[PDB]
Structures are given as structure tokens and as C-alpha cells.
Amino acid sequence: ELDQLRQEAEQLKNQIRDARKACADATLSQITNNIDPVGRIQMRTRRTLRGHLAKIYAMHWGTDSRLLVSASQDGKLIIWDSYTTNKVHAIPLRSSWVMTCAYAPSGNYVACGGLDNICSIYNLKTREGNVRVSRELAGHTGYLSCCRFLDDNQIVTSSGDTTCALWDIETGQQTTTFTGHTGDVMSLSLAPDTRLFVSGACDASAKLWDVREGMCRQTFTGHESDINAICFFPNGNAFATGSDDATCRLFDLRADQELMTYSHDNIICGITSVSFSKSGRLLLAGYDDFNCNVWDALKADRAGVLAGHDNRVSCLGVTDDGMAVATGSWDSFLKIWN
Amino acid sequence: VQLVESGGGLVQPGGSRKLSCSASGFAFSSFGMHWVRQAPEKGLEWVAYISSGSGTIYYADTVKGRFTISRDDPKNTLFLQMTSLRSEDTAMYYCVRSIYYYGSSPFDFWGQGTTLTVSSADIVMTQATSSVPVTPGESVSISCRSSKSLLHSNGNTYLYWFLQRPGQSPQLLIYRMSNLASGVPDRFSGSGSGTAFTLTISRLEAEDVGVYYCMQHLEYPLTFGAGTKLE
Amino acid sequence: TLSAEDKAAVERSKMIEKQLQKDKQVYRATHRLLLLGADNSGKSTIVKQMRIYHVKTSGIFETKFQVDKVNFHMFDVGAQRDERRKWIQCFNDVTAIIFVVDSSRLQEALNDFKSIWNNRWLRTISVILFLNKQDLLAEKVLAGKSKIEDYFPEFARYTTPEDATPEPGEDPRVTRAKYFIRDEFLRISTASGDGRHYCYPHFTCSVDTENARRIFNDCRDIIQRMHLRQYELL
Amino acid sequence: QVQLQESGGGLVQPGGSLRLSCAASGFTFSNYKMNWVRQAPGKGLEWVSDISQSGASISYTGSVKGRFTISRDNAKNTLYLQMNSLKPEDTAVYYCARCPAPFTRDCFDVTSTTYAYRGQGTQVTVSS
Amino acid sequence: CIKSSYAPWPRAILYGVLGLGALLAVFGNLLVIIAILHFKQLHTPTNFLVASLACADFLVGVTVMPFSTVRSVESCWYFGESYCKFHTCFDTSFCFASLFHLCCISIDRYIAVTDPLTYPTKFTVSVSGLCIALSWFFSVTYSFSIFYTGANEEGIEELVVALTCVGGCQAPLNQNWVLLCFLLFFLPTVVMVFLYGRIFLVAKYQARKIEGTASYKERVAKRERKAAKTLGIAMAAFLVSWLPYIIDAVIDAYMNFITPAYVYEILVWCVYYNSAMNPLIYAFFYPWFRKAIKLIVSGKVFRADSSTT
Amino acid sequence: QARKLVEQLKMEANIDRIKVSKAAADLMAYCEAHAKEDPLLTPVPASENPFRE
């Protein structure tokens, strides 16, 4: 009876592909053929934040667009003051293999994790003057790839294994487990309405989940290799992905299909980070060849290059007010552009 | 978090004594420290300051050449040395801790204090009223004045409010004119324009009885003010 | 220029920088090694001996040993999945990779060695190759129950290298088999890289006690070779 | 999406010959390196052969060397494997696998327990 | 004193080569110092010795070498008599500082090569700065205690050019201090030669190890032709420049002064030339310093430069 | 598993979808509405940004 279901699954799958085809009538490129081009965009580095012993993997802007936190493989977390380049805190880690970082929206907590299979949470506004560990979430069997804060008590993480999970910090237990992926999940992205979140795994597929229902809602497949990062959209009705086949693609939650692809012949390396501008007109992507291109999200035309790093770019972020974009790399330097 | 001061007593004029304030319950090495004295019936006065790591020491003009302060991090003890005490040095001395970084709240904890009895372009803060009669269950609008614009180019203002209960050490209420300290009720609020400032209480119960002080933190010689008493 | 609070903030920042420097001295004085290998190998026993001689789903294990006043950190994954495509990029700055092989299903070990050697992010990394469980191989080839030619047809047409230094009490058959396996492993390593990194084969047993000394010598050789190449004299 | 479909399976007497074809779609076949793997009954996955994206570098395992021939045709989007002089031993299920990233000399995790870019499978048995 | 100063041939070929040395020394040392200070990436306890050597080189060059050029091409200097002592003291102090800087550069290299494991924990910035304060102190002490007091002319009235006439200037030694000068030159030379020989032997052993595990009796030779060339030029420049002066001085001290006056300045100028060529052999010979100099000259030096090389 | 996979897949098939042109128009409209409040798109003069010099 194994085959009997397979046939149903194949026929059923087609019933979906046809439906998607039908629902498509025009291309986004044709619709935007009339609007004027965005023109050349020039950005120059304004700050250079140094002090990390080894390569850095992740960073996250604060809610006020003033503070930021970065994680490095030497086993340190550093909270920076972006304006004055000062250093606020320096947190040593139990395990030196860290892959992700997250800043709480309230500014009270910070989180990190990696190959140790543990999601640690640190208290910043403690009674005394030293940052201390407040909770250690241990329910995963792979490695932590990403983590995001919903509130001061809810956090969602993605692991090396297929499963994703939602935690309750007070109890330190799992309340919902998301399953359905085939490869390891690498990136994560929350919706602005904090009701849904997308996922990216190493099987060229992205899934849309419902936080309250705890069940997969939609699945998107348009890539050829593993997906590294997914940066959603300001509107929340679309999202972009970066994969290893040197492409970026824009999807939509409503029409449930691909819209446009951002690729160039001269680009061969993979993509490690994706983010959007404040208005959503600009798409910023990091690359393995030490560079960081800027794409017109409505025309798929390059509009600038953020050169200046010596090693590969590993993280990228944009402030809430959209005043600056910070870029990290494997040479242990952080830079801020305008 | 607790600080206890040791020493005090009676000393003849032109003598010497050493007061020690020992900390226990927090990371002493990462906190700057201050010494603040209160006359038997007057207001507060800042006398000394030792930074974290002992990299910066400041003194008041009154005790510049007679007092020296130092800290010993491994033993978590801080103590100053007094030489050639005059007859006006009689007061109660408090050790105050403060930490400085973006978004911090300095002057957030005060020690119990010890008593000792002996047998200029400075910003002047003036409290308009020395005593405001009031009942429980209305609003109060204590106000303060400054001789110089406390607003800085970076945006901060550096104005602090303190409340002292009748028989206890002072506690922080508002720092930088707009932020509640740690756990004070939402009734208190602060506002100002850089030269004139005011403090507002929505409702009063029996525990709002005390003296309300002021402070500035723009130029380092710290001036408090006479203070306003609510009874 | 700067307010009173601003100056104190900078003073705290400069105090943090001093702590970072102090930690950098320790970070530069330690060497980190990654220990790979299959389940059938003796990698578990090797780390057990070093630890003795000197937490339920943890994804990595650490052991610290000291040889001649110098320190080493050795990591081995413990709870990851079979996939290794993604988490292998973290170890792109270690001093060396220790590969353990049960030479006593030998093809997939060669495939793993080939994949590790040719990785883009694992270039410029030397490999210390341990051919574990040699007594078992000696006792197995001597019995004659199983012949190596089936799996490897080219073994019959092969001779012991002239530079080989066999043990004075061992049969030449075990020497021929051992050096055939070693040459098969070295063929992959001697086909690419070209001076960026090298392999250091060894003939060891799980119960041996000189493994730490061998690792120390190989690390010293790697660092010395890097220094000589840097100063334009090698 | 990326999908690989097998073909050419059947039962053959010992000493016979067979041809296996793998059909690929959803990705640029010319930029990737292709492999052949098999899974013997009661045994794990075992690598068999692979061919570079240009057809220059061909590798074989020791057991099947001198018997099997591997070839690829970029025009028709198809991978080929010819088998000659079969024996009762090699009667495993055969898969066509693709290396994860393009323009890369090597590829990891091809013979993993679970792999995203592996085919459905083909059953071939040799018996009398 | 003298009326014609025994002028040489009108062709200023000799004059031109000497000048090219001062310009090269000053410019190269200034560029090296700038590159070391500005980039803030090669700030290491190995490069501080090079920076101090370059400083000392520029400091001697800019002052001594133009005046020495005048005094050599004209054989009669006109820069006063109160500046003779200062010029001579500056000459003596700075060259020996360069020699003693070379002596710890060789030690640094030997420690790095022969003991790679415990290199960072044995050559910290304190040890690096300990030669910078020792070499300078020894050179200054020797120059002040021998030449400033004028102890080199005790009973030495044989020569007529200097110490008997106002116009001329020189500083020959007596039969009491040339032994000390020879010892001071000899000991660092022996140490440096021995250490570089040991380094070359280690390179030979490593080249032997790497070759073979891949003809063979000739495949080793290329590998040894580059290390031998590097160490040979590094030793040969210093040995060729410094040797003639010491031998001539000890010969003139042991026997009656018979060396012609004009050929003495040539030897002193060879000693100066050593300093002029040293930065070219210790900075431009390596790729990272070349990249730093190229960045500096181009002008990409501004706008938060932090490029690594 | 096969049953779980088909159930999940079956649950995704019956979803309401809209024309691609409508989504493209909505995207555009949103991009054009907030274009003025984008510092990266239109750099502000070097008088109120915090990262001057």
C-alpha cells in the first residue's frame, strides 16, 4: 500500500502545481516596468567596532536602534553602544561554540546558543552589577541555528535537527513542537504581527507556521540548494530567502508562489544573510566573496556594493528606524554604514 | 545589597580618624563610590569620589587637602582618612554606590551612615519653598531651580531627585528628570526645561512624609540644595 | 566636550578592553584540536586514556591535557546527527584535525578523508592520521582466514616500500599490508593542496601511551613549518 | 522543486548486463556533480561511483572497478550507469544522488541515512 | 687650516652615489615608521624592534650623512668647532644602536624558528622593549664615556688633520680603546652568525622532511637555494659594510698612523651605507610591508583604514 | 508516516489564493507609500543623523 499513497501524493501534488500556475497571470517585472529606477546607492562605513578575538557569527540590533549585541567563537558576548563605540558589557560563555544571538524587545534579556545544544538566557538588569545566567533550555538533539524573542517569557528556537520549538522561559519547558522539515533548519524570521513565522531548512523548502495552532500552513519550494537566511518583509505579506546557489527569491503568502529572483552571472558564491530596508524598497544580501550587494526589490537590478571586509560576511542587520545597517564578518570586525 | 559604616565617635579638633564602609552582596569591584555627609540639621553635601579601578579621584574644595580616600577590592572594603578635623566637620557620613554606562541609574543605593562629632563657579540649586503644608489625597508640585542650564548637547539633562524619610537614609526617586528608579510607584513624575524643574505626586499617603532633595551631575562638583519638607 | 557621566562611561569601556587583552594572552597560548572518526574506531578509548593519564544530550565534549608546560583542547561531537555539511565550518581555525581509522568497510573512511581534505573551508588545515588497532590487523592477516584482495584487487600487485622500517619481530606480510593501507590513504593527500597542508600518518594502538607525545611533535612540526614559510625561507 | 527519478531496474541472470538511467529536473544539471549509491539488504548505504560535471574525472569503488561504466549527458538531463557481468553479491537498491553545492570539487553527506537530494530508488536482483 | 683641501677630480660621480644613500635612508625609514604606527594591525613585539631600528636609522641619517657628505667630498667642513663634538657623538651612538638592534632581531628570529610552541609566552612586549632600552643605553654610555670626554686623543698627536687644527675634524682611537671597540663589534657578530647558521640547519632538516613524502637528490636543492640566499644576503650586507672600518682602525692603532686621510671617510661612508640599506633589507623584503607601503603611497591610508596584510 | 505526509499535504491544497498582479500592485503601493520615510533610500542631510563623521 506504500505505492498507492505515493501515487495519491504525486497526483495531489500536481493538483497544487496546476492551481498555482492558474493563479498566476502576470509577472512582477512587467508590473514594475514603468516605475523609475532607484539609481545608484553609495554607502560609506561610519564606525568600526573591534575587540573580538575570533570570527563572529551573529548580531542583533536593539529595539531602540542604539545598542547591539554580537557573538564570537572565542566565547564572548559584547553589547556595544553604537553611537559612541563604547562597550557596555562583556559576557563570557560556558561553551565557546556559539552560532546565534538574540536581543529581547524589552532590552532586559539576551540569548545565545550553539553546538552545546543549550539555549542560554542572560539577565542584564540584575540587582547587582554583573550579568548572570537565568535559564538553560535543554530539549534539543541537534545544534541551535537561530532564536528569536516573542516576549520576555516566550522564545522560539530552530535546531540542527528537523524540529523547531517554542519555549516558556519561566518553567524552562517546551509547549509546542513544529515538525515537517527534512533537513536541518538554519534560519528564522518572525512576522511583525507576532502571529506567524517562516523557516528555512537544508532541503530547498520554506514553511510558514502558526504559533497558536502549532501546525504547518504553507510550503514554498523554488530553490535548488540549501537555504541560509530568510528576512520576511516590512509588510508581512511576503518574504525573501538566500540560498547556496547564488540566488535570492521573493515569495508571497497570498498568491502562494515565487515572484522574482535576484541573481547575476558574475556571482558564484553562496548567500549568508538577507535583510530589508525600512520601506521595503531595498534588499541587502551578504555573500561569501567578502562583499555585500544591494538589490532593487522591485526591479532586480544591482544598486550598490558594500565592499570593505576581508573575510566572508556572516551576519547582517538593519535598525528599526532604518538609519543604518550593521555588517559582521569572519575577520572579527563590525562595521556600520549610512 | 547592604553597606555598613564603621568608625565615628568624639575627636578633639585637629585630630585624625578613619571611617570604613564595608560592602557585601554585589560586585563591589565594578561600582564607583561616593562619600556624602549631612550636617546635624542642614542638607546634604558631596565630599569625595573614587572611580572603579581607582583611576580617577575627585575632592570637594572644603576638604581638598585634609581628606584622602581609597578602596581595597579584594577585601570588599572602602575607607577614607581624615586629618586635622575642624569643628564644622561634625556630621553623618554615608557611602553611596553608583555605576556609569548607557542607561544606568547612578546613586541608586545609600548606606546606613555613621556619626562623627568634633568637640567659585559652582552651580547653585535653590529650592523655592522650605515647607509645603498638605493633606493625604491630592497632588503636590515641588519645584527646583538651577543657576546654569543643565541640558547637555547630547540630550541628557542630569537632574536627580532624592527622598529622605524621618530617620532613614535617602533613596533615589528620579534620575535625569524622567525615569523612575527601580520600584518607586508610578505616582511620582518629573519634568523640566533645563533651568526650571518640578516634581509631581499624584496622591500622598503616610509614607510620603520627609524632605525632598535635588542634585545636578553636569559639572563634577556636586551641589544638592536646601531641600523641601513635606509634613 | 564630554559630560561627567560620559567620561565615566569611557573609563569603564577602557577597563573592559584591559580584560580582553588579558584573555587574548591565554587564547593565543592554547591549541585546539578536532577529533573525528567512525564509531567502529577506537576514538572513545583514545580520549579515555588521555583524560585518565592527564548533561544528557550535550552536542560536544571537551578534554584538556598538558604536555611539556603547553596546553591543548580536544573536541569531539557527541549528539549531532549524521549530517556534517553545516557544523564542520566552525572548525576552520583549529591547529590540526585528528582522524582515527580502524584499519583492522574501509572505503567510506577513504571517502570521508577525501571529502575533509578537499573542503573549501577546511583548507590550510593539517591532518594527523591515526591508524588504530594494529595488533588486530596483525593477528587477522596472520590467520589467513580473510584475504584483502577481494575488496582491494590491486593489493597483490604491490611491494613493500624500501624506506619502510618494520618492527624486528613482525612478519613482512603485516608490514606489506600496513604500508599498503598507509599508501592508499596518502594517495589522496599527495594529490592536492601543494604545500598548504600536509598529513602525518602514524601506526598506533588504542592502549598506547605515547599518543600525546606524537600529537605534541606533530603540532610543533606544523607550527614550525608555518613560521618557516611565513619568513620566506621554506 | 529538485527531484530525481530512477529507471532501468529488473532481474538479471548472473553474468548479464543492465542499464540504469536517472532523470533530473528542477536544477541546472551542468553545474553539479552526480553520484551513484546502493544499499545492500541489512546493510548501510555504500558509495559506488561518481562523475564530475564535465565528464573528465571518473571514480569507481574497488569492488566494481573494471565492470561498471558511468556516463552523463548534459543535453538530455540524464545520468547513465552501465553494468556488465553481474554477480549474486551486488543485488542492492540503487540511487542516483547529487552533491549539495554547485561548482564544488567535493560533496558531503551523499550516503547519509536521510538525504534531501537523493532519488526514490531502483530494485535490481541477481538470482538463478 | 688647509688652503686647497686636496680636492678630488671634478667628476661628481662619488658625490652622486653618496647622496642617493641619504635620501633612500631617510625616506625608507620614515615610510617604515609611518606604516608600523598607522596600520594598527602589525603591532607585535617583533615589529617594535624593527620600528626602533628604523627610527635610529632615520635619526643618524638625517643629521650625520649630509655633513659627512660635505666633509668627505670637500675634506674640509665649515660647520664650526663646537659642533664637531656633537656630530662625532651622534655618529658613535647611533651606529652601535643599529648593531645591537640587529643582535636582538637575530635572537628574535632564532627563538621564533627553533621554539614555535612556546613563542608567544616567551617573547612578550616586555622582553621586546628590554632590548630597546638596553641597546640605546649601552651605545649612549659608550659614546659619552669615550668620545665626549675626549679620551681617544690621550697622547695621540701623530695625525695633523684633527685635534691640532681648527678646520679639520676626525675621531681616531688610541691603543687603549680599540680593543674595547673590537670586542663590542665582535660579540654580536659571533652571536648573529651562530644563530643564523642554526636556523639554516633547521631549514635544511625541514626541507629534507617535506621532500620525499610526495628527482629527489635535486628536488631538495631548490628548496635550499632560497633559504641560503635569504640568510646569505642578510649576513653579507652587514659583514661587507662593517668589516673594513674595524680592521683599518685596529691596524692604525697597533702601528703608526699610515692610512691616508681621504680613504678613511670612504670606510666611514660604507658604515653609513649599511644603515642606508638596512631598511630596504628588513622591510621591503616581505610582502606585508610592501602592501602597507603601497597602500600608504596610493592614499587609501585614510577613511578608517584597517586592512590586513 | 506516508499517512501523515499526505494528510499534511492535503491540508495545504485547499487554500484561497489571489492573482499575482494584485499582490504585485499591493507590494508596489506599500513601497511607494513609505518611500519618504526611508533614510537609506533618501539620505538625510548630515545634520540630524547620529553617525556623522
CA distance B56 to B58: 7
B27: closest CA of chain A, how far (Å): 6
Domain span holding position B24: 1-119
C-alpha cell at E12: 661628481
CA distance A244 to A254: 26
Q: B50-84 in b/e burial notation, b at 16+ Cβ within 10 A?
A: bbbbeeeebbbeebeeebebebeeeeebbbbebee
**Cβ(B68)–Cβ(B80) below 8 Å:** yes
**Cβ(E176)–Cβ(E254) below 8 Å:** no
Whether residues B15 and B90 fall in one domain: yes
CA distance A93 to C160: 52
Q: Which residue of E has its CA nearest to C223?
A: E116
**Cβ(B8)–Cβ(B23) below 8 Å:** no
Cα A250 to the center of its chain, rounded Å: 14
**In a domain? residue B154:** yes
C-alpha cell at E182: 673590537
Pick from B64, B103, B99: nearest CA to B84 = B64
The 10 Å Cβ neighbour count of residue A128 is: 14
C-alpha cell at B179: 525615569
CA distance A3 to B26: 67
**In a domain? residue B37:** yes
Domain span holding position D121: 3-126
CA distance E128 to E109: 12
Q: With H, G, I as helix, E, B as strand and everything else as coil, classify residue A269.
A: coil
**Cβ(A46)–Cβ(A84) below 8 Å:** no
Task: Dihedral sign for Cα C109, C112, C116, C118, please.
Answer: positive
Q: E246-285 in b/e burial notation, b at 16+ Cβ within 10 A?
A: bebbbebbeeebeeeeeebbebbbebbbbbbbbbeebbee
Which superfamily does A1-337 belong to? YVTN repeat-like/Quinoprotein amine dehydrogenase (2.130.10.10)
CA distance E139 to E185: 12
Q: Of B53, B158, B218, which has the smallest distance from its Cβ to C15's Cβ?
A: B53
> 643564523: which residue's cell?
E196
If you count them, how many residues does chain F have? 53
Compute chain E's Rg from CA coordinates: 22
**Per the CB < 8 Å rule, is C5 touching B100?**
yes
**Cβ(D11)–Cβ(D126) below 8 Å:** yes
Question: Which residues, at least 6 apart from A28, have a Cβ–Cβ distance to it below 8 Å?
Answer: A250, A259, A260, A298, F20, F24, F27
C89: closest CA of chain A, how far (Å): 11
**In a domain? residue B221:** yes
> 647558521: which residue's cell?
E197
**Per the CB < 8 Å rule, is B52 touching C12?**
yes
CA distance B54 to B73: 10
CA distance B52 to B57: 10
Whether residues B53 and B101 fall in one domain: yes
Whether residues B110 and B72 fall in one domain: yes
Q: Does E307 touch chain A if contact means CB atoms closer than 8 Å? A: yes
CA distance C113 to E127: 43
For residues E138, E143, E146 and E147, what is the CA-based torsion angle, rounded to 10 degrees? 180
CA distance E2 to E76: 8
Q: Which chains touch B (3 or more CB pairs under 8 A)?
A: A, C
**Per the CB < 8 Å rule, is E120 touching C25?**
yes
CA distance A187 to A223: 15
**Per the CB < 8 Å rule, is B101 touching C12?**
yes
Pick from E249, E64, E223: nearest CA to E171 = E249
DSSP F44: P
Pick from A193, A292, A296: nearest CA to A240 = A296
CA distance E173 to C212: 60
User: Which H/E stretch holds residue B197?
Assistant: strand B196-201
DSSP D118: B
The three-state DSSP-derived secondary structure of chain E is: CCCCCCCCCCCCHHHHHHHHHHHHHHHHHHHHHHHHHHHCCCCCCCHHHHHHHHHHHHHHHHHHHHHHHHHHHHCCCCCCCHHHHHHHHHHHHHHHHHHHHHHHHHHHHHHHHHCCCCCCCCCCHHHHHHHHHHHHHHHHHHHHHHHHCCHHHCCCCCCCCCCCCCCCCCCCCCCCCHHHHHHHHHHHHHHHHHHHHHHHHHHHHHHHHHCCCCCCCCHHHHHHHHHHHHHHHHHHHHHHHHHHHHHHHHHHHHCCCCCCHHHHHHHHHHHHHHHHHHHHHHCCCCHHHHHHHHHHHHCCCCCCCCCCC
DSSP D10: -
CA distance E107 to E193: 11
> 578613619: which residue's cell?
B18
**Per the CB < 8 Å rule, is C59 touching A186?**
no
Question: Which residues, at least 6 apart from E136, have a Cβ–Cβ distance to it below 8 Å?
Answer: E56, E97
C-alpha cell at C188: 589522496
Question: Which residues, at least 6 apart from C169, have a Cβ–Cβ distance to it below 8 Å?
Answer: none
What residues of chain C lie within 8 A of the CB of A117, using their CB? 57-59, 79
Q: With H, G, I as helix, E, B as strand and everything else as coil, classify residue B139.
A: coil
Cα B10 to the center of its chain, rounded Å: 24
C15: closest CA of chain B, how far (Å): 8
Task: Dihedral sign for Cα B140, B146, B150, B151, please.
Answer: positive
C-alpha cell at D23: 532523470
Task: Sheet containing A76-81: give its strands across.
Answer: A56-61, A67-72, A76-81, A87-92
Q: Which residue of A has its CA nearest to D3?
A: A224
What residues of chain D lie within 8 A of the CB of C39, using their CB? none
Mark out the alpha helices in chain A (DSSP H runs).
2-23, 28-31
Question: Which residues, at least 6 apart from B214, have a Cβ–Cβ distance to it below 8 Å?
Answer: B125, B127, B144, B159, B160, B161, B162, B197, B224, B225, B227
- Environment class of D91 (CB within 10 Å of its CB; exposed 0-12, middle 13-18, buried 19+): middle
Q: With H, G, I as helix, E, B as strand and everything else as coil, classify residue B152.
A: coil
What residues of chain A lie within 8 A of the CB of C95, using their CB? none
CA distance C31 to E116: 12
C-alpha cell at F2: 506516508
Q: Are strands D93-98 and D34-39 parallel, antiparallel or unpaired?
A: antiparallel
Amino acid type, B16: S
> For residue A318, how many C-alpha atoms fall within 13 Å in the half-sphere facing its CB?
25
- Environment class of E17 (CB within 10 Å of its CB; exposed 0-12, middle 13-18, buried 19+): exposed
**Per the CB < 8 Å rule, is C223 touching E285?**
no
Compute chain D's Rg from CA coordinates: 14
Q: What are the strands, taking DSSP E only, across chain C?
A: 30-35, 60-67, 70-77, 96-102, 126-132, 199-203
Q: A79-112 in b/e burial notation, b at 16+ Cβ within 10 A?
A: bbbbebebbbbbbebebbbbbbbbbbbebebbbb
Question: Which residues, at least 6 apart from D70, have a Cβ–Cβ distance to it below 8 Å?
Answer: D36, D49, D50, D51, D58, D60, D80, D81, D82
C-alpha cell at C227: 613560521
CA distance A283 to A229: 13
Pick from C89, C117, C83: nearest CA to C185 = C117
CA distance B121 to A287: 58
- Environment class of A177 (CB within 10 Å of its CB; exposed 0-12, middle 13-18, buried 19+): exposed
Query: Packing angle between helix E13-39 and helix E287-298, nearest 10 degrees?
Result: 90
Whether residues B134 and B102 fall in one domain: no
What domains are defined for chain E? 12-298 (1.20.1070.10)
Cα C128 to the center of its chain, rounded Å: 4
Whether residues B108 and B209 fall in one domain: no
Question: Which residues, at least 6 apart from D32, have a Cβ–Cβ distance to it below 8 Å?
Answer: D53, D98, D99, D102
The 10 Å Cβ neighbour count of residue F8 is: 14
D62: closest CA of chain A, how far (Å): 31
CA distance B162 to B173: 5
CA distance B151 to B146: 11
Please give the method by which this entry was determined. cryo-EM
Total domains present in chain B: 2
Question: Which residues, at least 6 apart from A327, have a Cβ–Cβ distance to it below 8 Å?
Answer: A286, A292, A306, A309, A313, A315, A316, A334, A335, A336, A337
CA distance A316 to A83: 18
Q: Which residue of D has its CA nearest to A205?
A: D1
**Does residue C126 come out as left (phi exceeding 0), alpha (psi in the -120 to 50 range) or beta?**
beta
SS percent in chain D: helix, strand, coil, step 5: 0, 40, 55
Task: Dihedral sign for Cα A148, A154, A157, A162, please.
Answer: negative
Amino acid type, B43: G
What domains are defined for chain C? 37-92+113-230 (3.40.50.300)
Between positions 236 and 275 of A, the ones with CB within 8 A of B are none
CA distance A3 to A1: 5
**Cβ(C83)–Cβ(C158) below 8 Å:** no
Q: Of E303, E304, E308, which has the smallest distance from its Cβ to A331's Cβ?
A: E308
CA distance A79 to A88: 6
What residues of chain A lie within 8 A of the CB of D28, using their CB? 224
**Per the CB < 8 Å rule, is C93 touching A142?**
no
Q: Of C84, C85, C111, which has the smallest distance from its Cβ to D47's Cβ?
A: C111
DSSP B90: -
C-alpha cell at A57: 557569527
The 10 Å Cβ neighbour count of residue C17 is: 13
**Per the CB < 8 Å rule, is C107 touching D46?**
yes
Q: Of B100, B217, B218, which has the smallest distance from its Cβ to C12's Cβ?
A: B100
Q: Tally helices (H) and strands (E) across chain F.
A: 2, 0
Residue that terminates a domain, selected from B97, B119, B141: B119
CA distance C108 to D45: 10
Residue that terminates a domain, selected from B119, B135, B164: B119
CATH of the domain at D88: 2.60.40.10
Domain residue ranges of chain A, discontinuous segments joined by +: 1-337
Pick from D32, D78, A227, D97: nearest CA to C111 = D97
Specify which residues A328 forms β-bridges with.
A315, A334
Q: Tally helices (H) and strands (E) across chain A.
A: 2, 28
Specify which residues B131 forms β-bridges with.
B229
If you count them, how many residues does chain C have? 234
CA distance C57 to C63: 17
**In a domain? residue B231:** no
